[PDB]
Amino acid sequence: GAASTNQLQYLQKVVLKDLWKHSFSWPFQRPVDAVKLQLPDYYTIIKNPMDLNTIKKRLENKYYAKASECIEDFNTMFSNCYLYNKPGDDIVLMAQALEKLFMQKLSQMPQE
Numbered sequence: 001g002a003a004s005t006n007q008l009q010y011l012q013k014v015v016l017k018d019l020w021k022h023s024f025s026w027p028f029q030r031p032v033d034a035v036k037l038q039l040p041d042y043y044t045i046i047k048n049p050m051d052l053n054t055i056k057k058r059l060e061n062k063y064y065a066k067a068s069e070c071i072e073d074f075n076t077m078f079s080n081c082y083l084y085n086k087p088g089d090d091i092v093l094m095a096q097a098l099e100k101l102f103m104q105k106l107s108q109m110p111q112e
């Protein structure tokens with residue numbers, strides 16, 4: 001298909017899949033459960049929550065019109081983690097490692 005089709009296909013079949021398979025993806029595989037995690041303030045602080053399963057469903061459901069919209073959701077997921085947590089926290093180190101992988105896969109995004 002067209003470049004834009006290949007881009008969203010790449011985000012689903014390669015980028016999302018490889019991030020999910022990474023050993024540090026588990027905190028990012030579901031929405032934050034504020035009661036379970038004992039964090040009453042999470043959704044007061046984070047007003048545009050995002051996670052990999054939401055992104056997965058959106059790609060499956062053909063929700064994104066173009067790749068940039070999907071990339072915005074991945075970046076939001078990482079930014080939320082940096083904003084909510086503190087420097088040096090384990091969850092931040094995990095996010096940073098995942099983001100490094102994300103950036104590597106993006107650097108090979110097709111443009112045709």
Ligand SMILES: CC[C@@H]1C(=O)N(C)c2cnc(Nc3ccc(C(=O)NC4CCN(C)CC4)cc3OC)nc2N1C1CCCC1
Pocket residue numbers: 026027028032036037038039042080081084085091
């Ligand atoms: C939401 C804040 C931040 C973040 O940004 N994301 C994305 C996140 C996504 N997922 C998780 N996952 C879990 C984190 C903690 C637990 C857990 O079992 N917490 C116990 C709760 C009861 N308490 C007595 C002892 C600790 C389970 C998790 O997943 C099932 N944590 C996340 N953190 C962490 C939240 C605490 C540090 C940072």
Ligand SMILES: [Cl-]
Pocket residue numbers: 053
């Ligand atoms: Cl599900």
